[PDB]
Design a protein around this ligand. Sequence first.
Ligand SMILES: CN1C[C@H](C(=O)N[C@]2(C)O[C@@]3(O)[C@@H]4CCCN4C(=O)[C@H](Cc4ccccc4)N3C2=O)C[C@@H]2c3cccc4[nH]cc(c34)C[C@H]21
Ligand SMILES: CN1C[C@H](C(=O)N[C@]2(C)O[C@@]3(O)[C@@H]4CCCN4C(=O)[C@H](Cc4ccccc4)N3C2=O)C[C@@H]2c3cccc4[nH]cc(c34)C[C@H]21
Lengths: 367, 367
Amino acid sequence: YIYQDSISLPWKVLLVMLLALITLATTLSNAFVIATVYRTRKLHTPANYLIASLAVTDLLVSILVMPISTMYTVTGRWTLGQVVCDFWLSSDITCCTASIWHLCVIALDRYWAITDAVEYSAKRTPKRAAVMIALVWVFSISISLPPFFWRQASECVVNTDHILYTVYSTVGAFYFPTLLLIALYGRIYVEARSRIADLEDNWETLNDNLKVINAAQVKDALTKMRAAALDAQKATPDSPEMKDFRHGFDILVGQIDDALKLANEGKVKEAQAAAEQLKTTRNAYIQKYLLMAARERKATKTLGIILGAFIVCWLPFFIISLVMPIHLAIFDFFTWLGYLNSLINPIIYTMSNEDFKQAFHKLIRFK
Amino acid sequence: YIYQDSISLPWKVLLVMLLALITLATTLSNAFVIATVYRTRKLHTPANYLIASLAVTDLLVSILVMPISTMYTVTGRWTLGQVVCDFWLSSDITCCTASIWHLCVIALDRYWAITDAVEYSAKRTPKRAAVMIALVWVFSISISLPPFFWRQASECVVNTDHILYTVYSTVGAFYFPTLLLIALYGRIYVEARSRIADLEDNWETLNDNLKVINAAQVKDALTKMRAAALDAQKATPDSPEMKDFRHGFDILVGQIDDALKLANEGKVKEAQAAAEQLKTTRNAYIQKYLLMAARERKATKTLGIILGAFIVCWLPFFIISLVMPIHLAIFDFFTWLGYLNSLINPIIYTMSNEDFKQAFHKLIRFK
Ligand SMILES: CN1C[C@H](C(=O)N[C@]2(C)O[C@@]3(O)[C@@H]4CCCN4C(=O)[C@H](Cc4ccccc4)N3C2=O)C[C@@H]2c3cccc4[nH]cc(c34)C[C@H]21
Ligand SMILES: CN1C[C@H](C(=O)N[C@]2(C)O[C@@]3(O)[C@@H]4CCCN4C(=O)[C@H](Cc4ccccc4)N3C2=O)C[C@@H]2c3cccc4[nH]cc(c34)C[C@H]21
C-alpha cells in the first residue's frame, strides 16, 4: 500500500510545485556560490575552494537526485526502470555523503587555522585541498558501490539485506563526521570565546576610555585603559611573530605611562594630547591583529550556523535509518529535510560571509 | 602536578591490594572460561569458541596491561622506560578494542542464529569464526599502530597530536561497535519478545488447562487450550522444516477436536482420558521446538546483560576521551571501569550460561 495514492489532486500538485521550487532554488543558489568564487579574484583562496566544492556537490544533488525524487515522493511509485534506479540510488548516497564530508574538510581547515595560524599558512595550499576533495569523492563513491550484491535484476530502495553494511554506511556518512565536528568545532568555540573575544573585549574597554578624553576622572580612565591593554596583550614554544602583537600593547602601555606622567604632574592639556597621540600610533601596530579577530569571529559564526543546520537536517534521517533495521511519510519527509541542507548551506554563506553577501547585492543590483 | 602524591600511605596500599585483587580475579576468571571450552566436549561449538576468544583477549588485558597499570595509577609516574611504554600503550589499545569487537562478533552470530536459524546453521562453521577472530585482531592491531608518529624518542600517554586519528580511533573502537549492537540487539530483543515468548506463553496457557482435568468447566478449558495452540502455531519464503513445528500443533488441535467430541456427547471419563493421551503425544512433536525456545531466551538474556555491562563500563571512558580534545582521577577511574569489563564478562557467562555455571560448581565441588 502507498499512502500517496490517498492524497488529493490539489495537495499532490501543490507538493510538486513546492518540491520543484526548492530543487531550482538549490540549483540557482549553489550555481551563484560556484560562479562567485570563479569570478572573484580575492576569493581565489584554498578556503573558498572548499566552499565552491561544497556547492558543486549540492548542485549535483539538485541535478542528479532531487528532480527525479519529486516524481517518486509525490506518486510513491518508481517508473524509470532498474538502470536509472541503480544510478540514482548510488548518486544519492555519494553526493549526500560528500556534502557532509566537505563540511568536515571545511571545519578541519578552520580548526588548523585557529589552532596553528603561523605553521598552517605554508601547508594550506590549493594543491592540498585538491587531494582532500578527491579523498572525499573517493570515500563517498566507495560507500554506494558495495550494495551491488543485488543478484536479482515499481519500487526503488537501497539494499538493507546486510545489517553490518547498513550501520557501516550510517557511520562513515554521518556518525563519524558529526562526532568529528563536535571535537573539531568544540575546540574552535573554545578558541573563539577565550581568545577572539578577549582581544576584542579588552579593546572595546580601551577605546571607551579614550572616548572619555575633569582631570581626576581622566586619571581613573587612563589607568583603566592600562589594565585592559595588559589583559589584551595576553591573547597572542618560541615567541616569533607573536612578539609583534605583544610589542604594540607594550608600547601602548609605555605611551599610557608617559601620558599619566603628564596627568600626575597636574597638566590636563599636555596629557589629553598625549592620549590622542597614542590613538593613531596604537591603530598603526594593533588594528592589524584586531581586524584579523573580526575575520576569525565572522568565519566561526557562519561555521557554527552551518554545523547547526547540518545537525537539524541530517540527524533525524540517520537516527531513523539506524532504527529502521530494529510510517513511510516520516522517511520521505526526512530525506527532503536532508535534501534541504543543500539549499540551506548556500543561503548561510550568502547571508553570513560578506564576500558572498556583497556578491549577491551585485547580481540583484542592490546598494 | 600529580594528585597521587597527595594520597596517604594506607589509601595507596589499600588501592594497590584492590587493583591487584581485580587483576588476579580477571586472570583466574577468564582462564577458567578458556579451560571450560577446551576441557568440555559439548562446548566444542563455534558460538563457545567466540566466548573462549573473548576470554583470551580479557586474559591478555589482565597479563599485558592491568598489573603494570596498578603501578602507574597509584604512583602517578611512569618508571619503566620508553620501549615498555610504547608496547604497553599499544597492547592496551589492541586488547581492549578486540574485547569490544568480540562482543559484536558474538552478537552478529546470535543475530544470524535468531534471524536465519535454518540457513545460518550450514554457514556457522568453526573455520568462519577463525576468520572473524583474525579480522578482529587485524583491525585492533591496526588501531594502535598509526600513533607511532612520535619523532621525539616520566609520563606514559597516547599521542593526541592529530585530532582526526583521536576521533577515528574512538569510532572504530567504540561508537561504531555500540551503534552496531543497538541495531543488532534491537532485532534480537524484538525476535525474543514477539516470538520466543509467544511460543512459551501460549504453551503455559495450554499446560495450565491440561492441569485442570465439573464436565462443563472442562469444555471451557478444552476450548481455551485450542485457542492457545493456534496462537502458538503462528510462532514458527517456502515452508520446509517449519511445517514440522506447524504439524505438531495442527495434530494437537485435531486431538483437542476429537477430545471435545467425547466432551460434547456428555462423556467425562472418555474425554478426560483423551486429554492425558494427547499430553504425552504432544510432548513428542512439540517439546523439541519448545526446549529450543528456552535455550534461545537464555542466550539472549546473557547477551542483554553483557551488552548492558559493556555500555556502563566503556561509555564514560569514550565519552571523556572525545570531550578531552574540546581532573586526571576521573580518567584514571574510567580506564579501570573499562578494565573491570574484562572481569564482569566472565562472571556474567558463569552465572547466566548454565554450561559454565555447572562447570564452576564442578571445580569448587558444589552440588
Ligand atoms: C537522503 N538520502 C536518501 C536515501 C533514501 O532514503 N532512498 C530511498 C529510496 O528513500 C527511502 O527513504 C523511502 C521513503 C519511503 C520509504 N523509504 C524507505 O524505506 C527507504 C529507507 C532506507 C534508508 C536508508 C538506506 C536504505 C533504505 N528509502 C530509500 O531507500 C538514502 C541515502 C543514504 C543511504 C546510505 C548512506 C548515505 N549517505 C548519505 C545518504 C545515504 C543520503 C540518503
Ligand atoms: C582503557 N584504555 C586506556 C588507555 C589510556 O587512557 N591510557 C593512558 C595512559 O591513561 C590516561 O587515561 C591517563 C589517566 C590520567 C591522565 N591520563 C590521560 O590524560 C590519558 C587520556 C587519553 C585517553 C585516550 C587516548 C589518549 C589519551 N591517558 C592515557 O593515555 C587508552 C585506551 C584506548 C585509546 C584509543 C583507542 C582505544 N580502544 C580501546 C582502548 C583505546 C582502551 C583504552
